Amino acid sequence: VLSPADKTNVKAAWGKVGAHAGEYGAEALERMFLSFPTTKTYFPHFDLSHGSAQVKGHGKKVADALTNAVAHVDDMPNALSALSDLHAHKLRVDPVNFKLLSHCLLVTLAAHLPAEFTPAVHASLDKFLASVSTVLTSKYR
Amino acid sequence: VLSPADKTNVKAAWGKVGAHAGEYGAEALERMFLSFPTTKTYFPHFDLSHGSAQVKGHGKKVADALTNAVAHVDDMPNALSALSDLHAHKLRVDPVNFKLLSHCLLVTLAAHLPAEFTPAVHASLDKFLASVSTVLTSKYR
Amino acid sequence: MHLTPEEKSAVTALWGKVNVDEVGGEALGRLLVVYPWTQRFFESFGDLSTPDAVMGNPKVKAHGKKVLGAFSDGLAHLDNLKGTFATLSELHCDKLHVDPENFRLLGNVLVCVLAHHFGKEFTPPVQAAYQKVVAGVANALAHKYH
Amino acid sequence: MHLTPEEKSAVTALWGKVNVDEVGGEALGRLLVVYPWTQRFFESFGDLSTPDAVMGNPKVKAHGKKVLGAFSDGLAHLDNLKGTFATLSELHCDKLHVDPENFRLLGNVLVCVLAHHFGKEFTPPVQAAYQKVVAGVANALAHKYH
Numbered sequence: 146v147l148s149p150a151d152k153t154n155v156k157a158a159w160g161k162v163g164a165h166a167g168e169y170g171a172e173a174l175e176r177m178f179l180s181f182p183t184t185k186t187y188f189p190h191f192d193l194s195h196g197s198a199q200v201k202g203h204g205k206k207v208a209d210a211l212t213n214a215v216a217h218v219d220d221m222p223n224a225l226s227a228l229s230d231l232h233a234h235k236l237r238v239d240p241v242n243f244k245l246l247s248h249c250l251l252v253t254l255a256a257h258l259p260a261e262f263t264p265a266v267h268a269s270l271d272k273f274l275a276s277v278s279t280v281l282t283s284k285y286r
Numbered sequence: 287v288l289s290p291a292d293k294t295n296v297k298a299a300w301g302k303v304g305a306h307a308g309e310y311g312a313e314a315l316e317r318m319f320l321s322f323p324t325t326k327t328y329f330p331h332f333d334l335s336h337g338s339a340q341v342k343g344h345g346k347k348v349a350d351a352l353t354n355a356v357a358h359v360d361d362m363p364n365a366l367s368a369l370s371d372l373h374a375h376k377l378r379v380d381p382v383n384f385k386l387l388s389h390c391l392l393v394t395l396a397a398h399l400p401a402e403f404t405p406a407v408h409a410s411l412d413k414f415l416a417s418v419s420t421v422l423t424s425k426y427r
Numbered sequence: 428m429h430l431t432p433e434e435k436s437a438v439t440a441l442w443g444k445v446n447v448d449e450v451g452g453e454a455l456g457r458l459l460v461v462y463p464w465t466q467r468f469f470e471s472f473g474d475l476s477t478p479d480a481v482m483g484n485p486k487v488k489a490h491g492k493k494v495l496g497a498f499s500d501g502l503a504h505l506d507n508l509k510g511t512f513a514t515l516s517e518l519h520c521d522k523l524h525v526d527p528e529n530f531r532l533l534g535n536v537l538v539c540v541l542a543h544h545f546g547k548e549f550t551p552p553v554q555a556a557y558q559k560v561v562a563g564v565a566n567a568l569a570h571k572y573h
Numbered sequence: 574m575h576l577t578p579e580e581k582s583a584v585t586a587l588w589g590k591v592n593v594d595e596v597g598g599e600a601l602g603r604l605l606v607v608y609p610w611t612q613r614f615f616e617s618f619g620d621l622s623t624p625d626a627v628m629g630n631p632k633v634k635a636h637g638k639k640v641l642g643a644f645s646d647g648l649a650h651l652d653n654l655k656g657t658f659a660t661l662s663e664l665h666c667d668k669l670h671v672d673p674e675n676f677r678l679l680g681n682v683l684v685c686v687l688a689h690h691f692g693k694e695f696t697p698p699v700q701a702a703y704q705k706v707v708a709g710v711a712n713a714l715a716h717k718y719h
């Protein structure tokens with residue numbers, strides 16, 4: 146459950162990402178592929194080499210989705226409807242993977258927001274990414 | 287998210303359990319403790335030996351909560367409120383453990399309801415236990 | 428893989444009464460029904476939209492047979508699961524692109540199928556022994572992932 | 574440990590720049606803040622009611638220093654984590670009753686602290702090696718559970 150304070154923390158933090166969102170999303174992915182190699186089984190069609198065009202493109206897409214999520218924090222199920230559908234019926238990514246990407250997103254943020262990444266904001270972002278993950282896998286079964 | 291079909295399936299299987307609930311409860315705990323020893327870290331104050339009265343007692347409490355949850359399938363949140371409070375603020379059981387107990391309940395149910403344990407019911411039950419689990423850890427943070 | 432001499436016996440004794448064919452199709456079918464996202468790998472099997480559809484699919488039945496056949500062979504080598512499954516491990520990763528989490532899910536579904544079938548003979552201690560085995564196998568199969 | 578020679582050195586090199594004092598307290602304090610259920614083991618540390626109360630709790634800080642000092646020692650033996658942590662494993666199981674899942678949570682919090690602390694120097698490949706190390710330490714500490 147995101148409290149009013151969680152929501153403020155997230156908006157602040159994400160406000161700071163601003164224009165770098167796509168660059169951070171690409172970085173988070175690369176961090177995921179390297180640290181949790183099993184996540185690569187979902188991207189057999191991608192060039193996972195460092196700086197790959199598919200990765201950069203995909204990273205922008207993921208980032209934009211998160212940006213939207215932040216913008217509609219109070220209406221996530223509706224905001225992310227197209228993605229919930231897509232993941233649930235086509236992609237079919239096992240739910241454990243979401244926890245892996247979330248961690249790599251948190252690490253990325255931490256490496257880039259020295260001032261903002263306080264323990265309270267860290268807790269808010271962890272909670273926010275868990276909520277996004279829950280929405281995206283809500284139609285699996 | 288439980289469909290009408292799921293609720294039907296659960297009411298039906300739990301119905302057959304009936305008066306044996308408490309016995310199945312204790313059986314599932316036993317299966318858990320032996321299959322996943324780490325779960326024992328939560329019952330250091332218990333006699334974990336076969337047929338301990340404590341496990342027996344505990345298993346009954348657990349079955350009782352489940353019965354209550356099937357009765358109130360449409361409003362688990364309120365029906366289990368005091369239990370989600372206790373878990374979140376007192377017991378503080380790491381959420382991975384819920385999955386361990388849910389597996390052991392399914393095992394128990396399959397070993398006692400051959401006729402009733404069809405794929406469709408299995409699926410409904412898995413979803414139901416997953417929901418009870420979400421309710422119970424809903425107030426962790 | 429640490430199986431006490433007793434656990435080993437328990438595993439062996441029950442396995443001798445198992446009809447792989449039947450059990451394999453049932454384990455694979457239930458997997459597909461309880462955790463529908465696992466259907467992502469079997470598009471070519473046809474319609475897997477209903478439990479009845481899944482459970483009666485012959486492609487599902489044949490695959491369940493193949494899989495449990497291999498499983499069955501590993502029981503013969505609990506001392507070297509890793510070596511025994513190395514090639515299948517590399518195949519699942521490089522060729523099939525199967526998230527190793529699926530191996531854990533199938534292992535838990537398998538245990539549910541043995542309990543369903545065997546009832547009361549599938550005691551807590553027998554389950555614990557099978558729990559160690561399915562984990563050992565899932566681990567052996569995930570071993571060569573990179 | 575299953576770290577490439579390249580990975581082993583990247584780990585060592587970064588660790589040399591770590592203030593175990595400061596980092597242990599940050600890492601243990603952040604565990605208590607992000608995953609509040611973990612507070613269950615520290616009722617005797619006093620007030621952990623708020624982020625602020627947690628972060629400035631001296632027992633929290635002193636304990637984090639102990640934890641990370643032991644973590645550091647294991648880094649000198651990447652090859653025998655099992656050996657270096659056997660005693661601590663028995664202690665954590667038999668005496669403290671700590672669910673080992675907590676070791677995993679702490680490992681991920683530490684990764685976040687290193688990233689926060691080193692910024693751009695904590696590159697994807699460095700994190701990867703550290704992910705390997707924290708997993709290795711959690712397993713070694715979980716080893717004597719029964």
Ligand code: HEM
Binds near residue numbers: 187207236238244278
């Ligand atoms: C924070 C959680 C996630 C978000 C917000 C997210 C978002 C997205 C978006 C925006 C797309 C693109 C849709 C399009 O093509 O128009 C997508 C596709 C995809 N996602 Fe997810 N995703 C998440 C988690 C995951 C995870 C954990 C995995 C697998 C490890 C995954 C695997 C995929 C794949 C394989 C595709 C299709 C890639 C392609 O072929 O272009 N996603 N996701």
Ligand code: HEM
Binds near residue numbers: 329377385
């Ligand atoms: C289906 C999920 C669960 C249900 C319905 C459930 C229900 C209950 C109930 C009804 C009580 C006793 C309340 C009272 O007497 O005041 C209880 C207590 C407890 N539960 Fe949960 N529980 C569940 C999962 C778990 C899990 C997975 C664990 C950890 C392995 C756990 C650990 C405990 C402990 C340690 C106690 C206190 C026992 C005592 O000291 O008497 N529970 N639970």
Ligand code: HEM
Binds near residue numbers: 494497518523
């Ligand atoms: C106990 C675990 C498993 C074992 C021992 C196993 C064994 C096998 C074997 C022996 C084959 C035939 C490979 C060959 O052609 O040489 C195979 C193929 C395959 N397996 Fe696995 N498998 C396991 C689990 C799974 C799971 C859980 C999935 C997906 C959820 C999966 C997906 C596949 C697929 C998609 C194929 C190829 C089927 C085809 O080409 O017809 N396997 N497996």
Ligand code: HEM
Binds near residue numbers: 640679
């Ligand atoms: C990297 C992982 C960890 C390491 C290396 C570690 C190491 C240690 C050491 C060296 C001690 C003191 C031993 C002694 O008394 O001689 C200790 C005590 C303790 N640890 Fe762990 N620890 C780790 C993780 C955790 C976690 C995650 C928790 C709980 C969330 C935990 C709970 C405790 C408790 C409650 C004590 C006893 C403190 C007291 O004396 O009151 N540990 N640990």
